[PDB]
Scaffold this active site. Structure first.
Site, PDB file in Angstrom:
ATOM      1  N   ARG A  92       0.766  -1.258   0.000  1.00  0.00           N
ATOM      2  CA  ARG A  92       0.000   0.000   0.000  1.00  0.00           C
ATOM      3  C   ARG A  92       0.801   1.316   0.000  1.00  0.00           C
ATOM      4  O   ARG A  92       0.195   2.362  -0.130  1.00  0.00           O
ATOM      5  CB  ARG A  92      -1.057  -0.003   1.127  1.00  0.00           C
ATOM      6  CG  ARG A  92      -2.166  -1.011   0.895  1.00  0.00           C
ATOM      7  CD  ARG A  92      -3.150  -1.066   2.065  1.00  0.00           C
ATOM      8  NE  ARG A  92      -2.700  -1.874   3.208  1.00  0.00           N
ATOM      9  CZ  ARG A  92      -3.147  -1.707   4.453  1.00  0.00           C
ATOM     10  NH1 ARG A  92      -4.070  -0.783   4.744  1.00  0.00           N
ATOM     11  NH2 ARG A  92      -2.703  -2.481   5.422  1.00  0.00           N
ATOM     12  N   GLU A 152       5.564 -14.604  -2.083  1.00  0.00           N
ATOM     13  CA  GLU A 152       4.265 -15.084  -2.617  1.00  0.00           C
ATOM     14  C   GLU A 152       4.645 -16.271  -3.580  1.00  0.00           C
ATOM     15  O   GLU A 152       4.012 -17.342  -3.542  1.00  0.00           O
ATOM     16  CB  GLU A 152       3.398 -13.986  -3.364  1.00  0.00           C
ATOM     17  CG  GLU A 152       2.874 -12.613  -2.736  1.00  0.00           C
ATOM     18  CD  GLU A 152       1.972 -11.629  -3.722  1.00  0.00           C
ATOM     19  OE1 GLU A 152       0.857 -12.041  -4.172  1.00  0.00           O
ATOM     20  OE2 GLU A 152       2.287 -10.412  -4.058  1.00  0.00           O
TER      21      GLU A 152
END
Ligand code: HEM
Ligand code: HEM
Ligand SMILES: Fc1cccc(CCNCCc2ccnc(-n3ccnc3)n2)c1
Ligand SMILES: Fc1cccc(CCNCCc2ccnc(-n3ccnc3)n2)c1
Ligand SMILES: C[C@H](O)[C@H](O)[C@H]1CNc2nc(N)[nH]c(=O)c2N1
Ligand SMILES: C[C@H](O)[C@H](O)[C@H]1CNc2nc(N)[nH]c(=O)c2N1
Ligand SMILES: [Zn+2]
Lengths: 405, 405
Positions: free
Chosen positions: B112, B286
């Site tokens: 973010r 990830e």
């Protein structure tokens, strides 16, 4: 479906519902508006009697004598005792069950497969700080058992109306000193600066090493704490080496064998045991990752990485990841060599998955704090990572408590 | 009470007051915390109207004109449109702001810091699956940018009382096929077995590799979904090698550059957008840790370990931990070599702490989900581990929704 939390395991595809949470009588910190599950701390006659009653029922249920004469007689006995003294006292086998049940109930402990096999030392006769010292020394010797470690807890007298508490000032029975330097840095364990400075204030002659075992500041009711040095032979330590990096021993690192928490309050049926140290055996990441590598503890990660000759000027070399792995291997290896019990994060978390299965059958669930159960290296490589957990407070319980100073 | 949020590495303290703006319940109650659950159990004129007014107020306040002519006039347009029709429409600039604020509000996203740099494609003028595919190919082209990746979202038409949703059936725009074998095992990615089968049953001729790119099933309202194969040149992949281990490349491993989520719902001012795929760039864990090393994914830990020649017979050699580090290293090396944007977990979490700090000044808080922000390896080695976090739901928001079949 059932009106109870649904809990999923994403590795296996399996599902359970936690019905145990229904038995929680004590609010934690979360609400529908916001989750406060990642925070570390979560900061009278009728009240007592209802808690006493609850516990006595748990006891009778655990020996299958619920609704019986012996059960209704114990309850009467306890309302009458509270009636005229404001408190009551636990039978021996009641304290043994309460203590095991508080461990079993502890959401942050990954070692709970062992919960049934806990030695409980009743020390509720203890009347002085010297006597605490003896009881504590005895606990250390029993629990250490020359490296073949054994679960134990020693329970000192409960809190009492008007009279002061029994307290151990140290947060553990064995901790290393922390010495604040002229240049602002710290020699030893930065986690222990305050307790170290308190021990000095109370007349301890301080050392000046990285790994000086602290003395105990023990307090009996309404008395100043008194200072006791543990005899070195009682305090088993393990020097650290690495199986293949021959230089690692040259670092002079070491850890103690016995992890013993000594500032938690043990609460049973409303009674409050302010001094009740317990001990188990280490999980290897407690030492290799948190104690040695936290920025705010020994912080040795850069040191090891420089010796390993890694590129410490760039995150993307994963120099932190490599060095932490090798520090954890050294902890495991050095404890094995020295025949001192220890458990790795893989084994520990497998055994906790089994515990979860057991408790699901035995009680319909298991209170568990995900963020503490998952280890601080290799998270998703351990099966607990893939298991949803429900967290709540049951009683009997271990609880934090404010420091006595 | 506004919660107190401590960082345990630095000793610093904030208070989240932003949580007071949450209008939406999460899964926790004071009886039990469900913060570790991945999904909600779950899966009106006055209501839509007050969510709308609030969103419009956010917008006019964002561009500093809170109170102006244009502000009061735009509120009436919305009121007039809901009164008469039961719904309303967003102006494009409003949409751009809502999508940015949805990302900013996403508690599970570690990316973010980038929230303000988001290309928004307005695809609300789209009346068929064909048209969705064209818009999708342009999104992929833009976002990929020959490896210099760029944040993007494409927004398809909102949900409407009268009718079915626009949907992308795939959970991401690029994904590898999982082909179930007669003998229970799986070729390719076990996470995609179900969607691989749906593609076959709606016509697709399947391949038989471990890394077959899936076609898209796109659904216009109340129509059977339709199949479209992505042009191979739109889908940038990176073959995986290791900087020092020569054999690693000959494992055949690879992965796609573009992480694009295509199954989440975007809610702005009470309006709901059922098809609104978004993409950024990968955090290497990830891929290296979850996608390649989860037991229920490609599950390559053992293979890598044997190649590295570790002792697989015992957990306490830490072979899993060792292998996982080399795989995450291969991933970062390989993306750096192919000039494809990647961020490692150390740089990512460092940038997220900075983001927390910007948001504490800008809004008095930041909703974050500690279990998702803390990476799957080397947790406590990253600054976010030591940072308490408050989780809650603000609108605009990304939400989960049912698979449409
Ligand atoms: C038998 C072996 C044991 C192992 C491996 C074990 C392991 C652990 C671990 C890894 C933690 C996390 C704490 C941290 O990292 O700071 C923990 C917490 C805890 N354990 Fe154990 N434990 C054991 C025995 C016991 C016993 C005997 C008790 C109590 C009678 C107990 C009670 C607790 C409690 C209360 C906590 C929470 C402490 C806190 O919140 O700060 N454990 N345990
Ligand atoms: C620009 C670089 C970006 C990075 C590095 C990043 C990183 C991440 C990571 C690591 C997660 C956790 C996902 C997982 O592995 O399960 C995540 C989740 C998420 N991100 Fe991002 N992100 C980025 C951009 C974006 C953008 C552009 C959006 C929206 C427009 C977004 C929205 C989200 C949302 C909604 C989630 C939650 C997904 C879920 O619950 O499954 N991110 N992000
Ligand atoms: F700085 C702090 C302020 C409050 C709580 C905190 C966590 C303390 N956690 C204790 C961990 C610990 C230590 C030794 N031994 C155990 N232990 C023993 C058996 N099971 C766990 N556990 C830190
Ligand atoms: F099997 C599941 C059921 C429900 C949720 C789930 C988690 C999926 N979470 C999104 C993962 C993902 C993938 C690609 N790209 C991103 N991404 C992109 C920008 N930020 C995150 N995120 C799994
Ligand atoms: C902020 C966060 O709650 C805190 O750092 C926690 C995370 N998980 C933990 N897990 C264990 N086992 N022990 C801890 O001290 C912590 N610390
Ligand atoms: C059960 C648990 O909540 C689940 O496995 C979560 C944990 N944390 C995660 N964190 C991220 N970033 N992505 C994930 O998929 C998960 N999975
Ligand atoms: Zn919670």
């Amino acid at each position: 479906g059932p009106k109870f939390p649904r809990v999923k395991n994403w590795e296996l595809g399996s599902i359970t519902y936690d019905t145990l949470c229904a038995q929680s009588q004590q609010d934690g910190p979360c609400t529908p508006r916001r989750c406060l599950g990642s925070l570390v701390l979560p900061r009278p006659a009728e009240q007592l009697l209802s808690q006493a009653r609850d516990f006595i029922n748990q006891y009778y249920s655990s020996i299958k004598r619920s609704g019986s004469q012996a059960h209704e007689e114990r309850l009467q006995e306890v309302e009458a005792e509270v009636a005229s003294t404001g408190t009551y006292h636990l039978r021996e086998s009641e304290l043994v069950f309460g203590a095991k049940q508080a461990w079993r109930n502890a959401p942050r402990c990954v070692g709970r497969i062992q919960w049934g096999k806990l030695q409980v030392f009743d020390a509720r006769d203890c009347s002085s700080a010297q006597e605490m010292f003896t009881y504590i020394c005895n606990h250390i010797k029993y629990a250490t058992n020359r490296g073949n470690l054994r679960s134990a807890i020693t329970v000192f007298p409960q809190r009492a109306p008007g009279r002061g508490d029994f307290r151990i000032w140290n947060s553990q029975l064995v901790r290393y000193a922390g010495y604040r330097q002229q240049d602002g840095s710290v020699r030893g364990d930065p986690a222990n600066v305050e307790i170290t400075e308190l021990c000095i204030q109370h007349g301890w002659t301080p050392g000046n090493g990285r790994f000086d075992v602290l003395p105990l500041l023990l307090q009996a009711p309404d008395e100043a704490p008194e200072l006791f040095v543990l005899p070195p032979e009682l305090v088993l330590e393990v020097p650290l080496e690495h199986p293949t990096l021959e230089w690692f021993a040259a670092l002079g690192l070491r850890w103690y064998a016995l992890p013993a928490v000594s500032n938690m309050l043990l609460e049973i049926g409303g009674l409050e045991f302010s001094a009740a140290p317990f001990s188990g055996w280490y999980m290897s990441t407690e030492i290799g990752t948190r104690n040695l590598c936290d920025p705010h503890r020994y912080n040795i990660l850069e040191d090891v990485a420089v010796c390993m000759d890694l590129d410490t000027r760039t995150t993307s070399s994963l120099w932190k990841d490599k060095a932490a792995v090798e520090i954890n291997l050294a902890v495991l290896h050095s404890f094995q060599l020295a025949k001192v019990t220890i458990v790795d994060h893989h084994a520990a978390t497998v055994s906790f998955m089994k515990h979860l299965d057991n408790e699901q059958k035995a009680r319909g669930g298991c209170p568990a704090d995900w963020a503490w159960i998952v280890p601080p290296i290799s998270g998703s490589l351990t099966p607990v990572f893939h298991q949803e957990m429900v967290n709540y407070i049951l009683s009997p319980a271990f609880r934090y408590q404010p420091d006595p100073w």
